[PDB]
Design an enzyme around this catalytic site. Sequence first.
Site, short mmCIF file in Angstrom:
data_model
loop_
_atom_site.label_atom_id
_atom_site.label_comp_id
_atom_site.label_asym_id
_atom_site.label_seq_id
_atom_site.Cartn_x
_atom_site.Cartn_y
_atom_site.Cartn_z
N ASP A 103 0.82 -1.20 0.00
CA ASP A 103 0.00 0.00 0.00
C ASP A 103 0.87 1.26 0.00
O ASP A 103 0.68 2.16 -0.83
CB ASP A 103 -0.93 -0.04 1.22
CG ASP A 103 -2.25 0.65 0.97
OD1 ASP A 103 -2.26 1.82 0.54
OD2 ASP A 103 -3.30 0.02 1.23
N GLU A 146 -1.58 -5.23 -3.66
CA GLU A 146 -0.78 -4.44 -2.73
C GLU A 146 0.25 -5.32 -2.03
O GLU A 146 1.43 -4.98 -1.99
CB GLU A 146 -1.69 -3.72 -1.74
CG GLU A 146 -2.39 -2.54 -2.39
CD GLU A 146 -3.25 -1.74 -1.43
OE1 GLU A 146 -3.47 -0.54 -1.71
OE2 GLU A 146 -3.72 -2.30 -0.41
#
Lengths: 207, 203
Positions: free
Chosen positions: A32, A96
């Site tokens: 992320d 992610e």
Amino acid sequence: KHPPLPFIKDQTLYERVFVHNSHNERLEFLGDSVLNNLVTLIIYDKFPSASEGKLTKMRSQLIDNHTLTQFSFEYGFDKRLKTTDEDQKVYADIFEAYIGALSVERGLDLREIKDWLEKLYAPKLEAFKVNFLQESVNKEAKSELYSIVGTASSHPLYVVVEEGNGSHDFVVECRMGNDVLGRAKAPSQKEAGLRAAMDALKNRQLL
Amino acid sequence: KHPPLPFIKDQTLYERVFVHNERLEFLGDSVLNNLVTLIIYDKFPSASEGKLTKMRSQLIDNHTLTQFSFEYGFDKRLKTDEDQKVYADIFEAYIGALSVERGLDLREIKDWLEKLYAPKLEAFKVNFLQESVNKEAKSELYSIVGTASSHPLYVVVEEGNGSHDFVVECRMGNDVLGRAKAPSQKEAGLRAAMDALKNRQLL
């Protein structure tokens, strides 16, 4: 997907990302972060003329689940994912984690990754350069604005304030008597004149 | 470039999408849902009902909805700031406004929408919606299990000089790790390694 997918060599890592203090969640967290910084750099560099507000909107659009899912299927993550069914925001969270793996597998380097993403996003960014860096078009705004607030008595005038195609300065003011309903800048006087009307219509008040 | 934003003449109907909107997003959603269906139906005449369901599903989700809302400065006509379901729903209310103001004759928003979707519809018709391509697979598979001393071999198991097409297996030891068919011997060989790579059990 037309850019080659950067590779995870370590088996124990690849399997952290596709097995399904407890389990891998640090890679989702690192991915992320890496993904949002990397995308920030890329757009900041490519769109020097965009406000912080537009940059914020561009970034939320390229880090969100729709696009990260699209990347995940063009790399067939639904197939690599050793599971059982399909909303279901999952594939973006894999993606992610995956970026989180590339990042650790390289000692937290990220230039090798920035370059892949710089290609992975090319079509999405050229889409934005055409239609989102810019403002709009609206060859109609002066009459559209006139049909809200204009009669023969008092109709809006478009008075140039700074002028000249010299190194670029054409800015026009759309005034209704004494008040500047909207101002805008464009390479020509009519483009700015229309854009000055376009800014005015962003604020429709008189009921 | 993208087409401009059609105009809303009626002030109060404009305010019923931007200063507040119920029942216009109802009408907006079904209208928009259908015009996109008609559009993709014409431009992908071989796409099965399953691809069409996926294509419609992507073109209508909140993501692309919200970015049409951002490219037309909906963030600025709107008087809580921030995907975003909500901007998607103002966009549906908008299509609904467009429709009411023209008596539910939708042919002229289809034209707008066709312009407006022209980029993404070319991307889908490029040769893939959610498909992979060939790869760098022979070498990365080699990196897991392969020494010069012992490594995998891509043997041709049928040949395809125009008539039919190649199938090549990826054999190592006694075990075939992956097979594939593709117009080439290279493309088949690469895909045959990709198949083996989609399953990194061990070996």
